[PDB]
């Protein structure tokens, strides 16, 4: 289905290697909350994307907290792949649909 793959990395990971399935590939550097909210709200108007795969290069664990909160407030599943966003948190909430590794 419509899945968005967003990566916040400093390591050089390019984008070209990345019934109705569509995939979104992007590369991001900054990790401030306003940027996250703006990007999420912009892509949410982009053809009804249901899938969100995210990873981070920094080691800040509040990114996963904000991702879980936004997933709950949008009812959209989100994954954690790398960095502070993939760090295992304390206690998820049934209202939330955020999942990690």
């Amino acid at each position, epitope marked *: 289905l*419509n899945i968005a793959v967003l990566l916040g990395h400093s390591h050089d990971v390019t984008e070209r290697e990345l*019934l*109705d399935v*569509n995939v*979104v590939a*992007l590369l991001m550097n900054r990790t401030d909350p306003k940027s996250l909210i703006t990007h999420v709200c912009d892509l949410m*108007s*982009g*053809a009804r994307i249901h899938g969100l795969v995210f990873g981070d290069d920094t080691d800040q664990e509040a990114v996963a907290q904000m991702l879980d909160f936004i997933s709950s407030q949008t009812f959209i599943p989100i994954l954690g792949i790398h960095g502070g966003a993939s760090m295992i948190m304390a206690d998820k909430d049934p209202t939330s649909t955020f999942f990690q590794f």
Partner: antibody, heavy 110, light 101 residues
Framework: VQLQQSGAELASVKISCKAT????????IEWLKQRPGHGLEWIGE????????NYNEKFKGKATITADTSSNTAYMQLSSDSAVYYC??????????????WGQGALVTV | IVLTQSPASLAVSATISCRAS???????MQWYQQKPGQPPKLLIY???NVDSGVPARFSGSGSGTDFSLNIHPVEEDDIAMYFC?????????FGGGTKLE
């Protein structure tokens, strides 16, 4: 896939749009206005599978769209405008969001 | 998004223009052919890729907010109205129409 609609009209009205070529619970249904003198417009879409509905700001509060999962029909109600109407369905491959299957057309007049 | 195209009427024995008021390297513009008394038919998608099952005489190009359409050679088929549609933001909007003779 073929589409059928109601007849002409001449207050409030209701127009039916019946599906007899596919699984009616999978694809969205969109309504179009084609008043003569210009190209076209866009009203709203409805998904019979779950019932999620979105409406256009210009036509908000004036057009109500409903569907029946049993008879596979689409109902659009305009309350309290003389134009030709169309109900259509996309191909399903998505992204492009184009219109391929077209109805017959119901001519309403006041 | 508001679209505007000229000329409203064209006299040939040709080309078309549609200027807008992109999505990560993808252009969102489609051209429809509508004979009198018939439903519209999609002709070009992504502003650069033609539709399968259509004559090769049609080709298009454009980027940003200025896109154009041209046809060669000229035959009896291109005798209807045409328009351009955007999909970068919901709801979509179409053109103003363009005859041919």
């Amino acid at each position: 896939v073929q589409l059928q609609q109601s007849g002409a009209e001449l207050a409030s009205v209701k127009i039916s749009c019946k599906a007899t070529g596919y699984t009616f619970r999978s694809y969205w249904i969109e309504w179009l206005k084609q008043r003569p003198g210009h190209g076209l417009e866009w009203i709203g879409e409805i998904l019979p599978g779950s019932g999620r509905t979105n409406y256009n700001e210009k036509f908000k509060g004036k057009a109500t769209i409903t569907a029946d999962t049993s008879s596979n029909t689409a109902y659009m109600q305009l309350s309290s405008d003389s134009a030709v109407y169309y109900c259509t369905r996309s191909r399903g491959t998505m992204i492009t969001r184009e219109f391929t299957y077209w109805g017959q057309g119901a001519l309403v007049t006041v | 998004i508001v679209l505007t195209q000229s000329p409203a009427s064209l006299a040939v024995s040709a080309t078309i223009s549609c200027r807008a008021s992109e999505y990560y390297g993808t252009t969102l513009m489609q051209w429809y052919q509508q004979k009198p008394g018939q439903p519209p038919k999609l002709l070009i998608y992504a502003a650069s890729n033609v539709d399968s099952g259509v004559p090769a005489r049609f080709s298009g190009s454009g980027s940003g907010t200025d896109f154009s359409l041209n046809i060669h050679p000229v035959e009896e088929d291109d005798i209807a109205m045409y328009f351009c549609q955007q999909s970068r933001k919901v709801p979509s909007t179409f053109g103003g129409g363009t005859k041919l003779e």
